[PDB]
Structure formats: structure tokens, C-alpha cells
Ligand binder design. Structure first.
Ligand SMILES: N#Cc1ccc(-c2cnc3nnc(Cc4c[nH]c5ncccc45)n3n2)cc1
Length: 289
């Protein structure tokens, strides 16, 4: 039982902007549509019925941890962009941690979407998805929000094939445990093969380290969801990058798009493109298709 009186009153006020009453939400706990460390995602119906995704935080039982998670993620309610996942609300109840209610993404996560062999997305399709992500990140960057876990697995596709940058704020979790490792300076699970060289060294994340991650995501897109550096152990990712080595050009990646990838992985953060610049460059490449 999570008591609101215990939480900081400023946090309570922010949360009360988006509260959803229990009688307004039906959750199908027998229908898992995603699995996280803090809890699973379930088919839900928000009431006029709306199909939604209900993310559980029930594995978080300590009130201090719940409070911190809400604090870090509530800013989500202040964002609005076609390429950024929105928050429908938060359901507080009598037993259990708060439920995070999110728009349902009918086509699931971007990585599994492009890996699906029946889909067989074209080069044009994939660059298009990459451009959508760039626009979403341009928006987040304009709000000075640093994502810290951008990857194809963490972007979703809705019923109209609009890509939503996801897995941030109240939706944050590890949705595929295979790609998080404790072999890093923090000793906690991190997406080390998506991280900028300087984040691995200094444990700091910036919009420019998000740009690095976006480069990796572009590589994922053009390989149709191949895992990056399959032949590099998590023990070696830092020295691999220090040696100047980088992901190789995907067979079906246009030369100019690979140049963009390489720019995202420049060892000096300040030399890497802004997301504004990425949108411009990728838009031109897309238009030639
Ligand atoms: N397999 C798989 C898989 C399932 C879910 C995600 C994922 C990645 N980032 C996220 N950010 N928020 C969510 C939850 C979510 C919102 N809407 C959804 N619609 C369907 C399935 C899950 C959701 N997610 N979910 C990634 C991989």
C-alpha cells in the first residue's frame, strides 16, 4: 500500500494532474505484452472503451524507490510530440504500486517489427523509421531531456506505423534483459553496446551520448535488427571503441547514411551532429528514395 501522504506534496500535485481512478481501468493480467524488471506490461482498457497498455511497477516495493521513480518520470506528462510516447495516466489504488497507463502500440517494438521476416521492410521503409526517431529525439533534446537508453527495442510503432520514442520516464524499464550488462563502472545493468565512449568512461549521459545511441539505432534499422558487435564481449566494448573501431557499414545501408552513423560516433562529443542536423540530413537521404 503506497500512501500519498508519505510522498513529497509537490510530487503528489504533479501526479494528481494525471490520476486515473481504478473503476476507470480494466487490466487483463493474463495478457502480457511486455516484460520488465519493475513489472510486466498488460492489455488494458481505459474508460467509451480505449485499448491501452498497462505497465506494472509492482516489483518496486520500497516507498523511497517508488517516489524516486515517479519524481524522475512525471515530466513525461509535459511532453507532446507525434514521435514521442505519451502518458495516458497513473492509476493509484489500495494494494500495489501505481500502474502506469500508456497508449497501446499495435505493432509492438521497432526491433521485432523489422526482424519479422513476413514484414520485409525495404531500405526506404527503414530510413523512414529512422527519420521519425530523429524527429522524436529532436523534440526531447529541445526540452533538455536526456533519454539514456535509445535503441530499436525501445521505440514502438502504433496502428498508423508512426514511430514513438519510448522506454523513458514512467515507461522506463529493461524490456530485453539480454542487452543490459553489469560490466561497467557503475556495476548496474546498462546497455553498454549502445553507450557513447565517454559515458562508459565517465558514467555521464548527455544529449550527445543520445546521438551516439541514435547512430547505433540507425545501424540496427539497416541490418533489420541484428545485434550490434556480436563478436565483442561486454568486457571489451570500451577498449574496442578506444582503438577507433566502429560498427561496419550494413550491406543495404546507402553510403551517405553510413557517413551519418560515423558522425554520430565521433570520439569528441561536441563534434557529433545535433538531432536537428540529423533530421535535415536523413530527410534529404530519405527523399532520394
Ligand atoms: N518482445 C518485446 C518487447 C515488448 C515491449 C517493449 C517496450 C519498449 N519500450 C517501451 N516503452 N513503453 C513500453 C510499454 C508499452 C506502451 N505501449 C505498449 N504497447 C504494446 C506493448 C508495450 C507497450 N515499452 N515496451 C520492447 C520489447
Amino acid at each position: 500500500h503506497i500512501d500519498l501522504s508519505a510522498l513529497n506534496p509537490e510530487l503528489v500535485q504533479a501526479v494528481q494532474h494525471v490520476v486515473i481512478g481504478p473503476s476507470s481501468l480494466i487490466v487483463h493480467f493474463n495478457e502480457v505484452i511486455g516484460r520488465g524488471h519493475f513489472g510486466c506490461v498488460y492489455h488494458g482498457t481505459l474508460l467509451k472503451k480505449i485499448h491501452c497498455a498497462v505497465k506494472s511497477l509492482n516489483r518496486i516495493t520500497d516507498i523511497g524507490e517508488v517516489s524516486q521513480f515517479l519524481t524522475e518520470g512525471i515530466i513525461m506528462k509535459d511532453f507532446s510530440h507525434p514521435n514521442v510516447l505519451s502518458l495516458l495516466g497513473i492509476c493509484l489504488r489500495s494494494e500495489g504500486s501505481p500502474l502506469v497507463v500508456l497508449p497501446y502500440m499495435k505493432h509492438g517494438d521497432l526491433r521485432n517489427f523489422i526482424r519479422n521476416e513476413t514484414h520485409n521492410p525495404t531500405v526506404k521503409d527503414l530510413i523512414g523509421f529512422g527519420l521519425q526517431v530523429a524527429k522524436g529525439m529532436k523534440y526531447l533534446a529541445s526540452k533538455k531531456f536526456v533519454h539514456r537508453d535509445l535503441a530499436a527495442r525501445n521505440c514502438m510503432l502504433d496502428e498508423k506505423f508512426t514511430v514513438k520514442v519510448a522506454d523513458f520516464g514512467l515507461a522506463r524499464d529493461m524490456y530485453d534483459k539480454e542487452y543490459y550488462s553489469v560490466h561497467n563502472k557503475t556495476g548496474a545493468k546498462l546497455p553498454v553496446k549502445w553507450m557513447a565512449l565517454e559515458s562508459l568512461q565517465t558514467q555521464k549521459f548527455t544529449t550527445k551520448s543520445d546521438v551516439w545511441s541514435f547512430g547505433v539505432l540507425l545501424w540496427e534499422l539497416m541490418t533489420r535488427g541484428a545485434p550490434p558487435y556480436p563478436d565483442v564481449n561486454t568486457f571489451d566494448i570500451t577498449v574496442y571503441l578506444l582503438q577507433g573501431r566502429r560498427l561496419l557499414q550494413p550491406e543495404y545501408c546507402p553510403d551517405p547514411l553510413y557517413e551519418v552513423m560515423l558522425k554520430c560516433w565521433h570520439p569528441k562529443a561536441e563534434m557529433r551532429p545535433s538531432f536537428s542536423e540529423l533530421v535535415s540530413r536523413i530527410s534529404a537521404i530519405f527523399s532520394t528514395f
